[PDB]
Amino acid sequence: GIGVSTGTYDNQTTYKFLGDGWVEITAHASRLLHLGMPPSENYCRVTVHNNQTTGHGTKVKGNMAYDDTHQQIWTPWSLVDANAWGVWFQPSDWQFIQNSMESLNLDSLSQELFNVVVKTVTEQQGAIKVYNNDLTACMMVALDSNNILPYTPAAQTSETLGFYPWKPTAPAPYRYYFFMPRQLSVTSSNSAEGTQITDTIGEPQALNSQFFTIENTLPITLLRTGDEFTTGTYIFNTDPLKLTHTWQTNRHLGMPPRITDLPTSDTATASLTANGDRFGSTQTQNVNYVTEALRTRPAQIGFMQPHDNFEANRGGPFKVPVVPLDITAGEDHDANGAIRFNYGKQHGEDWAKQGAAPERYTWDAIDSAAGRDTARCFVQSAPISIPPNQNQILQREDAIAGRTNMHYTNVFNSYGPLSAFPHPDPIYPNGQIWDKELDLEHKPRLHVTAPFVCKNNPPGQLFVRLGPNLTDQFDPNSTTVSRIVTYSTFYWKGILKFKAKLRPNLTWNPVYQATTDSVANSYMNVKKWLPSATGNMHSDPLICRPVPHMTY
Amino acid sequence: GIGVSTGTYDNQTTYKFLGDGWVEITAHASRLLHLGMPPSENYCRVTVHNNQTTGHGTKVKGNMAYDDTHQQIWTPWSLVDANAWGVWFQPSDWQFIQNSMESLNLDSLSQELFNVVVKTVTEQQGAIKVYNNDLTACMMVALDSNNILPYTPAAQTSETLGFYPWKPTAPAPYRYYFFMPRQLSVTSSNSAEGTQITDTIGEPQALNSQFFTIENTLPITLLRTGDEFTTGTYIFNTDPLKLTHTWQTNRHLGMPPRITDLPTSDTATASLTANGDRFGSTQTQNVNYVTEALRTRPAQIGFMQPHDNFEANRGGPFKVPVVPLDITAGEDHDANGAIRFNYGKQHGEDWAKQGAAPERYTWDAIDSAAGRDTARCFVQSAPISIPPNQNQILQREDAIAGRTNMHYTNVFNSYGPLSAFPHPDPIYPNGQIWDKELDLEHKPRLHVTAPFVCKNNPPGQLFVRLGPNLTDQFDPNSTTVSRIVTYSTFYWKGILKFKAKLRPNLTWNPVYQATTDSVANSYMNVKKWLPSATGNMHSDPLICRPVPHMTY
Amino acid sequence: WKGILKFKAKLRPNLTWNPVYQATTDSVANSYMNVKKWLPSATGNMHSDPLICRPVPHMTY
Amino acid sequence: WQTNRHLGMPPRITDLPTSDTATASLTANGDRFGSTQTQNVNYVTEALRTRPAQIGFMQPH
Ligand SMILES: [Cl-]
Ligand SMILES: [Cl-]
Ligand code: NA
Ligand code: NA
């Protein structure tokens, strides 16, 4: 099958309406991939320990947050990961879906590898390189259907496939965490100089050691140029994702109080009846009156989260994740889990930009009703008295354990049986799409890194690597390795299907839509999604869930 | 399928007579094509701005007509366009059809690509080049069936395939217009020096930006050496094209006036009855008499067109097209839309000719009854008096708005409900054959650039390009691109079918036929269509619609 | 008076790479498309200005 | 949005722009291929170039 293609390139997004507002979005994605031989032929147990006593080391006082120490199993295999919005839709698609649909769900996933080509490189004189075809050479493929091997979402480290169809990409090298004891003590710059920082890493433990190899756990297919490989279709079992945001906060839940009379002019206000004589209910029985702020609501929309909370286990210190909610007027970023990420040119960064530094963006939850304005928050002693003297009210300013900047809001946890909140927004195009659930008896109500969590087993990971291309001289009992310089290219097609539903339209007023404009320096300027004079592209994160929706 | 051909070369024109004068002309065309890799791997938004203050720039006073500024989307794809008479018939065929047929219509179109070959180039020492086969390499093909992408008739810029079967050709690179604001002010050489010329180009607009990619809109087929690709048959839906010209002008419509007596000798004239006593009708009731010139005719054959009218939109100034009619005795070229075009050696120019300059030819409408002799035209004030004093008649000489060379005929529009005219002539071999209709609610009664306009959807455009042939070292996060030097060759066969009808023959006198002769320096000298001592060819535009036909 | 007017309409295709121009509303004071124009006043005064249409561009040839 | 100036095959640029701020140039008017309806001048230009039809038109006002 040498001179015949084994597949079809297709990167078009097709919409099929079944009627009644239901839509079958079928996203085809194809890319040309490049795979080079592994630097090492075997599996390595690598360790990373940044315990320098200067700069961003862990030995310098107060540098816990900079910790990067861990151990990993480095494998000669590579992973083909397309789990990221940017791989399947072009900007316009995302816009169209966000502006017209109100619901979206995963349906099925399929992939195939085809048109494999393997080449060898040899030298010449002047020295120039020459490229030849190794027709008989092959490429190894493996598919972990049952997810035996460690799950490693490439989207988390901007290592998925490129978001540009006409540009080539490459698979990310496979590696996974290995257990290793890790202890690091807490210190501050103010902390005494004589104080010694404990920075330790231990030996591999029997109770937690897990070394897996692709060779020993999965069946492997060999692909020569005339071969091709298919995964067959996988069926998703996940919950629908709302494509709208909520705005009603506790202050907007239920029957608004009855105004006494209609405003007298277009600029006037209206007044309610006296607090003392108004009907209603409160949960503070020390005061005989009702007020929008004291009034009993059905439940609590949103909640206070501990920030910037760091916890520690055998592995080391780590920042506890927080539910991405609205950052409010006050713009309390860390308190409401805003997410900031850095990515490469393959995933959005302007191709024109130069320097090692990646592009960075901070994602602020679309929803406006579940965030928390730490500044304006406060707790009043009871029996409650209004107004309260400084000794019967704890607020932002007040300091905990005599620390100027540590306020109660930093360690306050408001989560409770009455807490209700929306689901994290999907992030085009850098966002991860689906995720494997944690194998623990008691699971989390959601994940921060992805909108769709597989209730059952998630689609299996696709692994590839070049077959060792040996030379004429080879000795097994020698650690020395000689291999012919080889590399390969091949195409990848994937088919992701969604089930989506068109939105209803009942408000009298026009609704907020995701648009583009011509105003210079505007975030939504058309010029950002067009090519430059030399073809440089730029794909910034797009808004989503533009349309508002009743919460109650 | 390495060592086996995947198609057949065929460039013969076959005539099948079904009887009753109906003919099925099946034109087979085949060419060997050459495709090199694109200079750039991606899509570019290129701009052209000739705003120099010297020479043919737009900044120099009175140089509007020289404007070339515009913006375009440059793509790494190439287009295979065979939409031009020269691709399907050899001179003799065209002659035979023009001399014997009276009607011609498009029936069906089919095409295929086959016998693909891809080669790589490497260096050597002395340095010489070496060519090798990349058996596993492939070529990309895409067919836009629904005409989603911008229609770009290659015939308009002499970029279709070559008109010589035994000579190789290459596809034209694909590119399309992109919206960009453009303003240019009007000035004349006489115009004051201090006067400043406004020459502006704006930023991409949100309301009119359309960036398409082949990858995202069409399914793409990969062709390795042993593969081949077919379009299947497309059926045309167009109106028939008359292969005759008309000669009757308003002066020859209807009952000629009755002569009083037959001429007395072979050199004598005959006379009609006195104007004052002749029967008939006119539309000028100030004079009591009829005359061939005043006499009422059924309708108006031909009409006055504004020339050389330039109009302006956001895009810029442009020459308004005009219906190609007869240029009359007076030879008023621009007033009757004569078409002049410049073409290369691949499309007619004498191969022997040397210099960058292309060959140029001016096409004068075959029809002799719808043109306008601006010089002899005139308007008479009414009530009409004959003869008219200089103040009651506007003629050529008179100047508009005190401008010596601007005469009324320059801005006069005679088009009206009574206007009737023939269809533009087909032009062998440089002429375009069919054309896509404009997607506007109210369409034009015809196109100037083509005789056949598709009532429905036109045949889709055929796109090709080489697959990026990567090297051993590749980095995605780098803007740097390294590719192996590659190029390819492949054959293209096309089958175009026409339905034509043999002409009737009723005149007593022999009729005008398209012939060839031996008279030196004659436009129709046989020597022009023969090869030179070293094989240099020359294919000049051939006459068409030689036979005259009754108009009424 | 009750009236019933029926239309037959077709959903649009989406093929451009770049996001397309949409008719939107905003919060910028004194903007022609400010939300406040389509809401009632404190005493119920309404205001309905002409809305844009045919926002999406389309190939002509 | 396409006006007479944006109808058909754009002229072929000689080379791709050298930088993100540069322009590209076409081949000399005198040597460029194409067609016009003004046969007094031996050259083609976006403004003189023959288009299929006339989009829009002048109205008496
Ligand atoms: Cl799968
Ligand atoms: Cl076709
Ligand atoms: Na913050
Ligand atoms: Na003329």
PDB file of N, CA and C and ligand atoms in Angstrom, chain B residues 109-111 143 231-234 459-461, ligand 2:
ATOM      1  N   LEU B 109     -19.736  19.359 -17.676  1.00  0.00           N
ATOM      2  CA  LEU B 109     -18.301  19.471 -17.419  1.00  0.00           C
ATOM      3  C   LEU B 109     -17.780  18.383 -16.481  1.00  0.00           C
ATOM      4  N   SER B 110     -16.663  17.760 -16.847  1.00  0.00           N
ATOM      5  CA  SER B 110     -16.014  16.777 -15.981  1.00  0.00           C
ATOM      6  C   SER B 110     -14.495  16.937 -15.982  1.00  0.00           C
ATOM      7  N   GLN B 111     -13.859  16.641 -14.852  1.00  0.00           N
ATOM      8  CA  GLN B 111     -12.402  16.727 -14.748  1.00  0.00           C
ATOM      9  C   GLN B 111     -11.800  15.667 -13.829  1.00  0.00           C
ATOM     10  N   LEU B 143     -12.169  20.400  -3.722  1.00  0.00           N
ATOM     11  CA  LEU B 143     -13.116  20.855  -4.716  1.00  0.00           C
ATOM     12  C   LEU B 143     -14.255  21.577  -4.034  1.00  0.00           C
ATOM     13  N   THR B 231     -13.962  14.638 -10.361  1.00  0.00           N
ATOM     14  CA  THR B 231     -15.004  15.564  -9.933  1.00  0.00           C
ATOM     15  C   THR B 231     -16.395  15.014 -10.165  1.00  0.00           C
ATOM     16  N   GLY B 232     -16.520  14.074 -11.091  1.00  0.00           N
ATOM     17  CA  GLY B 232     -17.844  13.567 -11.388  1.00  0.00           C
ATOM     18  C   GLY B 232     -18.418  14.576 -12.367  1.00  0.00           C
ATOM     19  N   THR B 233     -19.575  14.297 -12.953  1.00  0.00           N
ATOM     20  CA  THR B 233     -20.119  15.226 -13.932  1.00  0.00           C
ATOM     21  C   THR B 233     -21.057  16.311 -13.439  1.00  0.00           C
ATOM     22  N   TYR B 234     -20.788  17.532 -13.884  1.00  0.00           N
ATOM     23  CA  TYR B 234     -21.586  18.694 -13.530  1.00  0.00           C
ATOM     24  C   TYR B 234     -22.463  19.060 -14.723  1.00  0.00           C
ATOM     25  N   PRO B 459     -19.868  25.473 -11.922  1.00  0.00           N
ATOM     26  CA  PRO B 459     -18.977  24.380 -11.537  1.00  0.00           C
ATOM     27  C   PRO B 459     -18.018  24.877 -10.473  1.00  0.00           C
ATOM     28  N   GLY B 460     -17.730  24.017  -9.503  1.00  0.00           N
ATOM     29  CA  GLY B 460     -16.843  24.397  -8.418  1.00  0.00           C
ATOM     30  C   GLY B 460     -15.381  24.521  -8.793  1.00  0.00           C
ATOM     31  N   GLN B 461     -14.649  25.341  -8.038  1.00  0.00           N
ATOM     32  CA  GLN B 461     -13.231  25.558  -8.293  1.00  0.00           C
ATOM     33  C   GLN B 461     -12.386  24.411  -7.752  1.00  0.00           C
TER      34      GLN B 461
HETATM   35 CL    CL E   2     -16.487  20.112 -11.878  1.00  0.00          CL
END
